[PDB]
Design a protein around this ligand. Structure first.
Ligand SMILES: CC(=O)NCCNc1ccccc1
Length: 121
């Protein structure tokens, strides 16, 4: 139907927009600490601690599969990355500190993204 095409045109642009947001967020992780899923070969006990793992590569896969219906779903996953890290790692680690910085620096980008998504509809 013409409707479903229109719906799919918007989803495509939401995806285009989120792709830009994603690059900007990941630019704030220069050490690439959150770039890939935590390896179970390197951290065997990880899933005993963290029930819903997340990282930028996994978000990107879901993104290109147009798996985010809105910004809120996208933000949930970004928050997972941060919150998981701040629990698994103690406060005085490079890991925890990287999460704090990514959260702080990401807030700017996500504040703008909300206003654009709302604006463009
Ligand atoms: C994002 C995160 O939680 N990173 C710290 C836990 N993962 C880890 C993996 C390999 C070597 C050392 C640590």
């Amino acid at each position: 139907s013409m409707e479903q095409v229109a719906m799919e045109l918007r989803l495509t642009e939401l995806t285009r927009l989120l792709r830009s947001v994603l690059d900007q967020l990941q630019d704030k992780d220069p050490a690439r600490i959150f770039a890939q899923p935590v390896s179970l070969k390197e951290v065997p006990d990880y899933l005993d601690h963290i029930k819903h793992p997340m990282d930028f590569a996994t978000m990107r896969k879901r993104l290109e599969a147009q798996g985010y219906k809105n910004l809120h779903e996208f933000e949930e996953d970004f928050d997972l990355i941060i919150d998981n890290c701040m629990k698994y790692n103690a406060r005085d680690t490079v890991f925890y500190r990287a999460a704090v910085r990514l959260r702080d620096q990401g807030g700017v980008v996500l504040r703008q993204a909300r206003r654009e998504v709302d604006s463009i509809g």
